[PDB]
Design a protein around this ligand. Sequence first.
Ligand SMILES: Cc1cc2nc3c(=O)[nH]c(=O)nc-3n(C[C@H](O)[C@H](O)[C@H](O)COP(=O)(O)OP(=O)(O)OC[C@H]3O[C@@H](n4cnc5c(N)ncnc54)[C@H](O)[C@@H]3O)c2cc1C
Ligand SMILES: CN1CCC[C@H]1c1cccnc1
Ligand SMILES: CN1CCC[C@H]1c1cccnc1
Length: 438
Amino acid sequence: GGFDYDVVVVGGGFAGATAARECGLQGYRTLLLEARSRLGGRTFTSRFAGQEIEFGGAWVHWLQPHVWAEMQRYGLGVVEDPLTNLDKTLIMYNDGSVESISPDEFGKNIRIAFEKLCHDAWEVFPRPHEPMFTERARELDKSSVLDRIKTLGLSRLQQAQINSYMALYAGETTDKFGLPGVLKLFACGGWNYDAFMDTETHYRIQGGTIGLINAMLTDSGAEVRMSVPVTAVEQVNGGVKIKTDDDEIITAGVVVMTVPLNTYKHIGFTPALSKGKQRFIKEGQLSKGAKLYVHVKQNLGRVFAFADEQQPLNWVQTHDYSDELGTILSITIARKETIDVNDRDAVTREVQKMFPGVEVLGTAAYDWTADPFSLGAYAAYGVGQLSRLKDLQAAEGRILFAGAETSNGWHAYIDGAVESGLRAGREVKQLLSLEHHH
Ligand SMILES: Cc1cc2nc3c(=O)[nH]c(=O)nc-3n(C[C@H](O)[C@H](O)[C@H](O)COP(=O)(O)OP(=O)(O)OC[C@H]3O[C@@H](n4cnc5c(N)ncnc54)[C@H](O)[C@@H]3O)c2cc1C
Ligand SMILES: CN1CCC[C@H]1c1cccnc1
Ligand SMILES: CN1CCC[C@H]1c1cccnc1
């Protein structure tokens, strides 16, 4: 009806890229606005110490249906990051003490702890993609992961392991981490430890995440604008007026918001969003971590380590290793407040506090929690949030909402973002059609 564009997609992560592809291919005049000067959002492929790395999400699996189907469409295969026959497996406790565990007794103890925590996933989530199907799922949304970890009677090692694991998934202390979200994720993977674990940091996309992002946006035909942050959305005249941070207005029939939930405080809405959505906007989601790579010139082979929630290096892994190269450690930090990643002294310190005979040569980090356009990492639900997710998914007039947080399945993954983007495309068609179906 005379607007600048039929649809504006705010955000150039996987959710926005997918929503723009769906829309563009319908023939809609489509615009995507990205605040950063790069695409990918919470995925970001860079380079460090001579090789391609990934500062955010990177690992996918065929059991993740939405992203997998997109890899078929665009013909992208997988690249395997094996870690068979590990050389060292460590557990660092809340006290800072570091125990080298035998690798095979390591995995078996985490399996016991994991399978005990997810003992009722089959029953609670018969339909992982309808999380609130069973009533017990809704009751369990009054408990936290720690509430249950305390009722499982695990050994000392097993408790530290699962809590590190769960603290990483939460990017927070396990007492704030909603319990159902974890069970549903396990269900998505087939209610089976071996299957779920096979999706963990195992397979990467040929050509990186940015390759799939580009393949979607190229396919879409949409206009794409970088370094254009959106500061306000106003519903008016049968459409929307979108305001950028340099005060220029763009009109559209509809808007698809795909920005991370934690970044919504930076955007004004007229009229106001529903109270349910507002509650979500002020609560946010939990994760407040960072990503960190380190370069050691002391070959360490295949390595893994947990650290409980009171140490910084909660999830450590070997990205590569050569007698020449030394080792490059891939590390995910659950809470950035436990360590300043952009300080080479504290990093070298804490790294050596786990691998004492190490010389720290080079480091590269990404502080997702300090970045104004993520203000966090992967989606992590608090207690009682999953039960209210409909409030976050609901359309508000001619404003639709997507993003991994708003997905039903793999909400902490690329796949969730893709899923939410397919939904946004469908909701856009309903709003701009000849026969409607809201
Ligand atoms: C450290 C880390 C490890 C993870 N590992 C994996 C993994 O291995 N595998 C996996 O599948 N998932 C993983 N996850 C989670 C995952 O990557 C995300 O679920 C996924 O990338 C989310 O995409 P999104 O489109 O929903 O949101 P985002 O990727 O955050 O997209 C949001 C976009 O909106 C933009 N934006 C924000 N505010 C504005 C504004 N005001 N105006 C305009 N644009 C704005 C942002 O710049 C950004 O591009 C990881 C994530 C992180 C951070
Ligand atoms: C790679 N896995 C992710 C969860 C723990 C880790 C693992 C698995 C098997 C043996 N040691 C560590
Ligand atoms: C992709 N996962 C979703 C939950 C946390 C995230 C993850 C898992 C393993 C290592 N780093 C990040």
